């Protein structure tokens, strides 16, 4: 059998991964390994979407998030040359029991003293733009809302942000979704209380920048959220508080290409959280097998900086990848006519593998 490497444009002194295409050719006992020389290219464009909890627990957090677009760009300057930011909002589904359906409290889901907007599952406040000023202004115009139970419905908002590629404004760059909460999270099954039995189907249900289909769709499962976040090249940054740190820290163990971090009661360290999380993410590379099976098994052996070599799931991962650092991935398709797609998660830049056997 043979690597048959083709269109291997050399990694730029933008190709971050070479070969960018190859066709391996053997089957039983195949150990065909093609070194994916992954070079972290300086100044690769990044799109970011900041999904923010808008329940009353984040009333003070929203004040800090107000001036974030300009600041996040000012800080990702040193990592990328072309960056964009967008904003979304979420509180909870607009039905009982997550809110009280009294006529008096439907306008103000919180207490009488606490003025709150009527509940809304998700509102696309801003679509991706290179203008952080629009981010700041549209975030400031957002009014705090509330719900009744401690967990918040952010998973439907995450799915809505992911699916609407055109309306949100996703580009063919690395996408980051800083999902910020201070309380727990609702998920699939949490909707049975309100009689919301049909789950989040994973489509663009955004009308007038408002997820008006709250009452019809349930919060998605963590598996479906993972599928939609990975399939759309979105690296989540679960910025959550310390009271739920043993919650989202375990959550990151299941969700690929994530990096949880702790914030204060007012999310004051959200920018440092994003920077450190993306430093962990970029210095990481979870190559994906894309989707291929029944005749293909990929074993991985990374050889990253400082001589550390991983095996299996460890071998699929590299660490301590500096700016321009070259790592070698002993990617061995064991197999045991098709062109499947190998992607470093969070990267639209791709290598093409054809197992013509």
């Amino acid at each position: 059998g043979s690597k048959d490497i083709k269109k291997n444009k050399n990694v730029t002194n933008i190709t971050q991964i070479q070969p960018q295409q190859l066709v391996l050719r053997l089957r039983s006992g195949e150990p065909q390994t093609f070194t994916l020389k992954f070079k972290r290219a300086e100044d690769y464009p990044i799109d970011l979407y900041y999904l923010m909890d808008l329940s009353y627990s984040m009333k003070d957090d929203l004040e800090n998030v107000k001036s974030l677009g300009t600041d996040l760009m000012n800080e990702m300057r040193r990592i990328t040359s072309d960056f964009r930011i967008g904003f979304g909002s979420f509180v909870e589904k607009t039905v009982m029991p997550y809110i009280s359906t009294t006529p008096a409290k439907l306008r103000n889901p919180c207490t009488s003293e606490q003025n709150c907007t009527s509940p809304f599952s998700y509102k696309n406040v801003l679509s991706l733009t290179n203008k952080g000023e629009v981010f700041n202004e549209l975030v400031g115009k957002q009014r705090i809302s509330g719900n009744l139970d401690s967990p918040e419905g952010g998973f439907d908002a995450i799915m809505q942000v992911a699916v609407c590629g055109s309306l949100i404004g996703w580009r063919n760059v690395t996408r980051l979704l800083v999902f910020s909460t201070d309380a727990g999270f609702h998920f699939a099954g949490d909707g049975k209380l309100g009689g919301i039995v049909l789950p989040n189907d994973g489509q663009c249900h955004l009308e007038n920048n408002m997820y008006t289909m709250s009452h019809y769709y349930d919060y998605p499962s963590i598996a479906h959220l993972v599928q939609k976040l990975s399939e759309n090249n979105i690296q989540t940054i679960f910025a959550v508080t310390e009271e739920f740190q043993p919650v989202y820290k375990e959550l990151k163990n299941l969700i690929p290409k994530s990096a949880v971090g702790t914030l204060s009661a007012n999310s004051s360290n959200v920018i440092q959280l994003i920077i450190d999380a993306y430093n962990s993410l970029s210095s990481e590379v979870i190559l994906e097998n894309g989707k291929l099976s029944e005749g293909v098994t990929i074993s991985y052996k990374s050889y990253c900086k400082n001589g550390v070599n991983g095996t299996g799931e460890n071998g699929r991962k590299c660490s301590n990848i500096s700016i321009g650092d070259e790592v070698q991935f002993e990617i061995s398709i064991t197999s045991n006519s098709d062109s499947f797609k190998i992607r470093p998660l969070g990267f639209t830049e791709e290598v093409e593998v054809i197992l013509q056997y």
Partner: antibody, heavy 121, light 107 residues
Framework: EVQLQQSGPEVGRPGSSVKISCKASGYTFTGYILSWVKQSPGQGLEWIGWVDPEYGSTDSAEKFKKRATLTADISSNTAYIQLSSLTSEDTATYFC??????????????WGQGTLVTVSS | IQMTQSPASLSASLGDIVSIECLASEGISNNLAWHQQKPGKSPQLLIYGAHSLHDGVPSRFSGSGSGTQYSLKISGMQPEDEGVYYCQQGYKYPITFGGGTKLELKR
């Protein structure tokens, strides 16, 4: 060549409203933020604020949030600044300026010819 | 952020090299630009990204610095170099400018 053809020198009364235009040509009017940089005769540049033809949002400094009603027209590729509650002390030149692609490159690369409005009675 | 760019005004001989500094109130991470104001005309961009040169600008202009301190170095002046020079920051809002240096060549 990106050009910003502004209206002629406007004349307004103290307390009235004037609508300075900026017929932006040579670039996507909606795709780029358009800012106004007031420049009094003999003074420096003060950033009034900005318009956004894409989503319609505007944000100004603390001195122009309630006074200068900034607006943009998508169809005509023309942006307006409404000097509500004018004062004769604001007789100056108003520039419509385009950022250098935006992002952190918030540099005023392109400047219009200047609308020297003469607000007087 | 308020940029008290130095100096207020200066005059130098023909062909002399001069550095104009724009110190920022906080580290702006190379978020500084430069503009030149010819009389009766709109200002023109000279240096973007605190190091790079704008198209159509003579190569005598140069930008440097990082963090908080930045410099606008002009490799020799000419009569075409007259104008008022403003350093523009892009870190916080509102956008801030310098006081403007009157680069009037002497004779």
């Amino acid at each position: 060549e990106v050009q910003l053809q502004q209206s002629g020198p406007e004349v307004g009364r103290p307390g009235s409203s004037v609508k300075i235009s900026c017929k932006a040509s040579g670039y996507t009017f909606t795709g780029y933020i358009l800012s106004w940089v007031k420049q009094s005769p003999g003074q420096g540049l003060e950033w009034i604020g900005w318009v956004d033809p894409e989503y319609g949002s505007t944000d100004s400094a603390e001195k122009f949030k309630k006074r200068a009603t900034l607006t943009a027209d998508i169809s005509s590729n023309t942006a307006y600044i409404q000097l509500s509650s004018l004062t004769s002390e604001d007789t100056a030149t108003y520039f419509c300026t385009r950022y250098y692609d935006g992002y952190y490159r918030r540099w005023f690369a392109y400047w219009g010819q200047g609308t020297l409005v003469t607000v007087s009675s | 952020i308020q940029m008290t760019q130095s100096p207020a005004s200066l005059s130098a001989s023909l062909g002399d090299i001069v550095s104009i500094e724009c110190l920022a109130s906080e580290g702006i991470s190379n978020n500084l630009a430069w503009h030149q104001q010819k009389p009766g005309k709109s200002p023109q961009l000279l240096i973007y990204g605190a190091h790079s040169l704008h198209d159509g600008v003579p190569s005598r202009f140069s930008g440097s610095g990082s963090g908080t301190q930045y410099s606008l170095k002009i490799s020799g002046m000419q009569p075409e170099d007259e104008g008022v020079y403003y350093c523009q920051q892009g870190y916080k809002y509102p956008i801030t400018f310098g006081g403007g240096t009157k680069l009037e060549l002497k004779r």
